[PDB]
Every structure is written in structure tokens, then in C-alpha cells.
Design a protein around this ligand. Structure first.
Ligand SMILES: [Ca+2]
Ligand SMILES: [Ca+2]
Length: 147
């Protein structure tokens, strides 16, 4: 839950335990497994982001700063993902599971970000892949990450 003396030594140990290449780094294909043996638990997409980016660049290796970096984020709370899902619910005045330009227009005002039905309507289309003019926790995570 924090980078405390013991905690640091905890994952730092589990870090050198997976050191294959020996370049002071561990293969990305081991990070997830490292997050399993540890109280860590990111999002499928996240672990895929690193493995995919590092997939073909440096045999997929990680540094103490790389792992501890993500651990720093998760430790800060749990995953920081719940914060976005929460805003999604807010932006969703209905319980249907999707958001409409109208709802989006009402909430943004609640927060304090005065927006025009046009600017946000566009942000919805850019996030709407399936094609329904509505936003789901998935389409939401995408557009919000653009902030
Ligand atoms: Ca709705
Ligand atoms: Ca949609």
C-alpha cells in the first residue's frame, strides 16, 4: 500500500527473482506474474500496454523504476481505475449503462466545466466505436484518458 522500507524490499526481492536476461531488468512477460504474487492487480489493458509496447523494442525488459512506478500508482489507492468508473456513473444520469449527449451536458455543468452540446457530442463520437451515440464504461475510459 506504500513504498515503505519493508515493502520496497518485498517487491525488490520478487523483482530480482524473475531477472532472466540479467540486464538488471526482468522480462515484461513476468510483470503480470509478479503482480500476482504481490498484492498488486492492474487492469488487463494496462499489463497489455507495457507488454505490447515493450513487446518489440528491448526483448520486453523492465527496470526497478518501471515496476515500482506502477506500484506507486496502485499503492496510492488500489488501481486508480475506480475513480474513472465513478465519474462514468455520474455522467450517466440513467441506469441503462450508457450515456447520452444530454446527460453529459448536465453533469459537466455540475462539475464546473461549461461545455457546448457540440464539443461534447464530438467527444462522444470519437469514443463511440460500436456506433450508437452512447458511452459505456469502456468508451468512457478511452475519452477520459485523453484529458
Ligand atoms: Ca444514460
Ligand atoms: Ca457506444
Amino acid at each position: 500500500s506504500e513504498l515503505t522500507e519493508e515493502q520496497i524490499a518485498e517487491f525488490k526481492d520478487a523483482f530480482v527473482q524473475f531477472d532472466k536476461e540479467g540486464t538488471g531488468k526482468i522480462a515484461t512477460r513476468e510483470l503480470g506474474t509478479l503482480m500476482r504474487t504481490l498484492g498488486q492487480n492492474p487492469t488487463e489493458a494496462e499489463l497489455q500496454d507495457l507488454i505490447a509496447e515493450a513487446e518489440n523494442n528491448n526483448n520486453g525488459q523492465l527496470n526497478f523504476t518501471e515496476f515500482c512506478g506502477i506500484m506507486a500508482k496502485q499503492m496510492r489507492e488500489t488501481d486508480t481505475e475506480e475513480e474513472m468508473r465513478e465519474a462514468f456513473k455520474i455522467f450517466d444520469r440513467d441506469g441503462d449503462g450508457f450515456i447520452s449527449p444530454a446527460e453529459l451536458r448536465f453533469v459537466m455543468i455540475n462539475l464546473g466545466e461549461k461545455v457546448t452540446d457540440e464539443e461534447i457530442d464530438e467527444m462522444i463520437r470519437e469514443a463511440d466505436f460500436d456506433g450508437d451515440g452512447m458511452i459505456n464504461y469502456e468508451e468512457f475510459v478511452w475519452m477520459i484518458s485523453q484529458k
